[PDB]
Structure formats: structure tokens, C-alpha cells
Design a protein around this ligand. Structure first.
Ligand SMILES: [Ca+2]
Length: 641
């Protein structure tokens, strides 16, 4: 069961879903729960919320907690009893997971969430999720008992500056209206966020425009609102003015409408490292913001895991439990990586110190469901949170037909590589020791263990199988579309590892040379993918298996070529990444830029020059002049483009 319930007693008996059943409470129970139940399916089945006639007998079994429920299955009856309407829906989401092949385990569950608000913030930079992706997400959240979706894509012009002031055009407004309706059907609070801070004026015109925009969103069905002041500069960072705006929204709108739910703000100082401990920003918000307004927080850094000491620090200043904005699996600063590994690092004992916990995901929506599912599990029952089981459970849920293949792929696509936020994840941990030994031995001319070579061999083989099967999988086409470039790159990685290992075994000179040439071609193939796929402005291209596998392959290749060159007095090139241009630092190609990893460069052809940046604030336009050689950051830009 995911999330795992707070309390579970199993009887080691099974029953059959009743082919004939009596349904008690269908007319008075949450209609969303009743629809699920009727889809799933005499023996009595009692469904309802505390206070309903149908569940009077179980009133003392029903947890006295928001979103709590009692679920019972035995020989004589099935009970699905919520403390509230959302609890009833959640009982059904647990019920659906117990049902296997027309059979039910005999069980009694008392369940409720440890964290009040649980969900996703679509709060990233990059291409906002598609409408269809969002529809799919909302269903996924209901299944996993996530009750919150915060809509705030940084690159939505009607969310951020300057068009936050403008109502959505009709097409987008209709789409938003449909998302809210689907959210509500799935027991998810659609929270519409606004990000006005970069150009807001602290005057009546803009205050009214803001309230007017919120009114428009209310007309589309929105009942929870957020104001985001993150990643801005200027007068919009003023905490007194921020708190006054939020309190006005609360007092003139949120407390005035019949049916508003959450009001949330994201501060400008939204993590410890971005906060001024000697400044008044956070204490001003904490003292001045009305107590019903939630304040968001990403931890000790922009990207960090949530610790007891960290959350203590913020809670003391804001005078309320922080609403956590967790910046994983968001990849908008390492866009060339997929972050498909487990969710871990967050303290499992601090539920009481948070008002909420939401994950900021990748611009790859389906891919993000691995982490989302795991966050849902963590947020509902942090005490019982099991990192690796939940990750496996997520994968089997996402892609049942190829779960082992998706596990293979995800386990080697977890780390972020080096980055300005200093955040890293484990990757390829299984084979890391065998890799580390093999390379240690091989480099120093000691004999490597056969089992380690065999493990590397097995892994590369499993990677190719996984890649080919995932490419062709039709159970979740949108997921496969998202990951496809990385899958191609992952396959090439595995093929390259297989050939490098054949070089290590090195039967004869001729065979070695064949493998060496094959490896050079695969290097070039990886370059082409890195240049043709995922060509975004910031971290273009496709990286995979970066932490352990690619380094092992590259260093082994460089080593065996060195030994070949000694033994045969040869001059084979031992470089590990393909580069078509020539220049000890490696050149790099990013989009239409040719770049020395921080005297003379020769391009593989003549191009119109755009400009050189250098930096030891040097810049020069080349006015479309033909250029093949350049003699002297160090970045030539060309028309390519
Ligand atoms: Ca009811």
C-alpha cells in the first residue's frame, strides 16, 4: 500500500469481491468516492462520512483527523468510512490497491495523513506542462492522496510579469477551467499562484489589478490562491508591503468569499542561504502576516533536503509551521539530466513542524511521477517512509509492463552532475565498488577480479536490453517520448562500455584496433545526440550514467589505449569525448557556441563569426565574417545557428 497506512491489521485470509452486494450509503457519501467504488464492482458494503447513517456503527473506529478514514474488509462486510468527504475518497484509493484479481485481503485500516497539505508545485523554469500532462497528473495525485496542486510555471506570462495583470485569453482560460474541474473530481485543491513581484507597484492600480485577476480566476472555479515573491529583485522584495498585500487579499477576498481554501505565499527569502539572518525580512513576515496565511520554504539552500534543525530555524522566525517547497526532482538548472532516482534525505520525524510539503518537479511531467509518488508516500506517512521500496513501487505503478527495464534506466539516471546549487544524488551504487576496484587494479597493472569484469559486462548488457524495450513501449507513450533522447544516449553508453571491455581483453592488435575504431564511432554518435537533442538555451543536450558508468568507461578506455601505445609503440588518440573542432583543456560545443572548458582553435569548416567572449570584460562582434581559425570563459559564437 502506497502511501502506507498509519495502522494496518491483516488477517492472512482472503475473500472475493462480492458478485452480489448490498451498498449502504451510496446516496449520502462523497460522490467522488462512490463513483470509484461503482467502477470497481448480498455482502454489505457500507460507505460514508462520519455522521452519515451508513457508518454509525463505526463512528468510534474513524480516526478523528482531517482526511482520515476507517477501512475494514472481512467475511461479512466491507466498510469504507471517512472522517470527512476526502477521507472517504482516500479509503477508496486504499481499497483499490487491496483489490487483486477479484480478491481482497481481510484487513482493518485506520489511516490519516501526518502532513496537512501534500502535493506538487509546478513552479519551475522551462516549458510548462502540457494540458494533457496536467490532466494526467491530477488523476495521479488523487490516487496517491496528494491534495494540492499549485499552478505557477515561471514561464507562463499570465502568471508572471508583466501579464500577471491580464486575464488569461479564452483558450487558456477554458483549459484552466477544465483543470480545476478535474482537480476537484480527484479531491485536489487547485491553487492558482501569481508572481507579480518583479514589476509590481505598491499602489492602488496594481493592488486592484491583482485582486481583479484573482476574481477572474475565481470565476474559472479557482478556490485556493498563492502569491509568489521568489527570484525577484527591486521594490517588490519589501516585506512590510508584501505582508500588507497578503493581509488585504485575506481580508478583502479570502475571508469575504463563501468558499476559499488555501492562501499561500512564497517569500523572497525562501531558504536559509538566501535569507539575511541579521535582516528583518523573515521576522517581519512572521509577525505581520495573518496567521492563516501559509509561508513557503525550500530549506537551508535553494535545493536542499529538509532537516529538523533547518525547519526549526525558519519556524522560529515565521511563527508558524513552514509549508515546504521541495526542489526535487526539478532539473531546470541541470536540464541535460533526468533525475529519476529515489526520494530521500528529508527527516521522517518532523511532520508536526510543517503545514505542507510540495515537490517542484521536472518539466518532464511523466518522468517526475517517480518522485511525486514517493513524495506522496513520504508526506502521508513519513514515519513509515521506505525510500527504495517506494521508488520500486512507483516504477511498477508507472510502467508495469517494463518495470525492471525502467528501474535499470532510472538507477543510472539519478545524479545531477556538478552544479551551482551544490546538490547531488547517489547513482549506480550497486556497481560502484566493482567499478572502483576494477579501475584501481587495471590502472596500476595489478590483476582485476574476473567477477568485477563480469559484473560490468552484465550491467552493460542489461542497459541495452532496457533501452531497446523502453523505446518500443506503448503502455505510457508520453513517458517514452520524454525520455527517448536519454534512452538513445544510455544505449550508446552501454555499447561503448561493452567495446571498451573487449579492448581490455585485447586478443590481438587487429582486434583491438577494430574495437578502438568502434569506440571512436560511438563517441561521435553520443556527440551527435548531445548536439541534436534537448537543445535548450541553458544546459543543452543529453547526459546519462554520469556519476559512475561514464567515468569508468572513459578512464578504462584512456588506460587501455595508453598500454596499447606503449606495447606497440603506437600513437592512438586516447580522448574520450568526440570533438570535431581542434584546439590541454577540452573544447565544448553548446548550440552555436565553441567553447574552451574554463591559444588557437580550428573549426571543422568556415562559419560566419558572430562574436567572442573571453574572460580573464572581453567581447567583440565579428560582423558575420568568415572564420575557421581563432588565435590569442573563452567562447566563439558562430552562425549555425
Ligand atoms: Ca455524507
Amino acid at each position: 500500500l502506497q502511501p502506507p497506512p498509519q495502522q494496518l491489521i491483516v488477517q492472512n485470509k482472503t475473500i472475493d469481491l462480492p458478485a452480489v452486494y448490498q451498498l449502504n450509503g451510496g446516496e449520502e457519501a462523497n460522490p467522488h468516492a462512490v463513483k470509484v467504488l461503482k467502477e470497481l464492482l448480498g455482502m454489505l458494503i457500507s460507505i460514508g462520512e462520519k455522521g452519515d447513517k451508513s457508518v454509525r456503527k463505526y463512528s468510534r473506529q474513524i480516526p478523528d483527523h482531517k482526511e482520515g478514514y476507517y477501512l475494514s474488509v472481512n467475511e461479512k462486510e466491507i466498510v469504507l468510512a471517512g472522517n470527512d468527504e476526502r477521507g472517504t475518497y482516500y479509503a477508496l484509493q486504499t481499497f483499490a490497491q487491496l483489490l487483486k484479481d477479484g480478491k481482497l485481503p481481510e484487513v482493518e485500516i485506520k489511516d490519516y495523513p501526518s502532513v496537512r497539505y501534500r502535493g506538487v508545485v509546478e513552479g519551475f523554469y522551462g516549458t510548462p506542462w502540457s494540458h494533457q500532462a496536467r490532466l494526467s497528473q491530477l488523476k495521479f495525485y488523487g490516487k496517491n492522496k496528494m491534495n494540492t496542486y499549485i499552478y505557477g510555471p515561471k514561464d507562463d506570462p499570465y502568471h508572471s510579469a508583466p501579464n500577471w495583470r491580464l486575464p488569461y485569453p479564452d483558450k487558456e482560460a477554458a483549459q484552466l477551467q477544465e483543470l480545476v474541474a478535474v482537480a476537484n473530481e480527484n479531491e485536489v485543491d487547485f491553487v492558482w499562484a501569481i508572481h507579480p513581484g518583479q514589476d509590481i507597484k505598491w499602489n492602488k492600480e496594481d493592488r486592484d489589478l491583482l485582486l481583479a485577476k484573482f476574481e477572474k480566476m475565481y470565476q474559472l472555479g479557482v478556490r485556493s490562491f498563492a502569491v509568489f515573491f521568489d527570484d525577484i529583485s527591486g521594490e517588490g522584495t519589501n516585506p512590510q508591503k508584501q505582508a500588507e498585500l497578503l493581509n488585504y487579499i485575506d481580508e478583502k477576498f479570502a475571508q469575504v468569499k463563501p468558499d476559499i481554501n488555501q492562501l499561500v505565499m512564497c517569500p523572497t527569502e525562501y531558504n536559509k542561504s538566501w535569507s539575511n539572518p541579521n535582516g528583518n525580512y523573515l521576522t517581519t513576515l512572521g509577525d505581520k502576516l495573518n496567521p492563516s496565511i501559509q509561508i513557503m520554504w525550500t530549506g537551508d539552500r535553494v535545493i536542499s533536503d529538509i532537516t529538523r534543525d533547518g525547519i526549526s530555524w525558519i519556524n522560529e522566525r515565521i511563527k508558524r509551521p513552514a509549508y515546504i517547497w521541495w526542489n526535487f526532482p526539478v532539473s531546470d538548472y541541470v536540464r541535460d539530466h533526468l533525475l529519476l532516482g529515489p526520494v530521500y534525505g528529508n527527516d521522517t520525524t518532523i511532520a508536526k513542524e510543517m503545514s505542507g510539503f510540495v515537490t517542484n518537479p521536472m518539466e518532464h511531467a511523466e518522468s517526475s511521477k517517480i518522485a511525486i509518488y514517493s513524495v506522496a508516500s513520504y508526506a502521508w506517512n513519513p514515519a513509515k517512509y521506505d525510500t527504495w521500496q517506494t521508488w520500486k513501487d512507483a516504477i511498477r505503478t508507472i510502467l508495469p509492463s517494463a518495470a525492471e527495464e525502467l528501474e535499470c534506466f532510472a538507477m543510472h539516471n539519478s545524479d545531477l552532475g556538478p552544479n551551482g546549487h551544490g546538490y547531488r544524488r547517489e547513482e549506480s551504487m550497486d556497481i560502484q565498488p566493482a567499478a572502483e576496484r576494477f579501475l584501481k587494479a587495471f590502472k596500476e597493472g595489478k590483476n582485476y577480479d574476473k567477477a568485477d569484469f563480469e559484473t560490468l559486462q552484465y550491467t552493460f548488457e542489461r542497459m541495452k536490453e532496457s533501452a531497446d524495450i523502453l523505446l518500443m513501449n506503448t503502455e505510457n507513450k508520453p513517458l517514452i517520448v520524454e525520455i527517448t533522447p536519454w534512452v538513445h544516449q544510455f544505449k550508446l553508453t552501454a555499447e561503448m562500455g561493452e567495446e571498451v571491455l573487449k579492448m581490455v581483453e585485447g586478443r590481438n592488435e587487429s582486434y583491438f584496433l577494430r574495437k578502438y575504431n568502434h569506440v571512436k564511432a560511438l563517441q561521435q554518435q553520443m556527440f551527435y545526440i548531445d548536439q541534436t537533442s534537448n537543445q535548450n538555451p541553458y544546459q543543452p543536450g543529453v547526459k546519462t550514467a554520469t556519476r559512475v558508468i561514464k567515468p569508468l568507461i572513459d578512464r578504462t578506455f584512456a588506460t587501455v589505449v595508453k598500454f596499447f601505445n606503449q606495447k606497440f609503440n603506437a600513437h592512438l588518440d586516447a580522448t574520450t569525448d568526440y570533438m570535431p573542432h581542434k584546439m590541454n583543456l577540452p573544447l565544448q560545443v553548446k548550440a552555436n557556441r565553441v567553447l574552451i572548458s574554463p591559444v588557437e582553435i580550428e573549426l571543422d569548416a568556415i562559419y560566419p563569426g558572430e562574436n567572442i567572449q573571453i574572460n580573464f570584460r572581453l567581447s567583440a562582434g565579428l560582423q558575420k565574417a568568415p572564420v575557421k581559425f581563432v588565435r590569442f570563459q573563452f567562447v566563439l559564437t558562430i552562425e549555425k545557428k
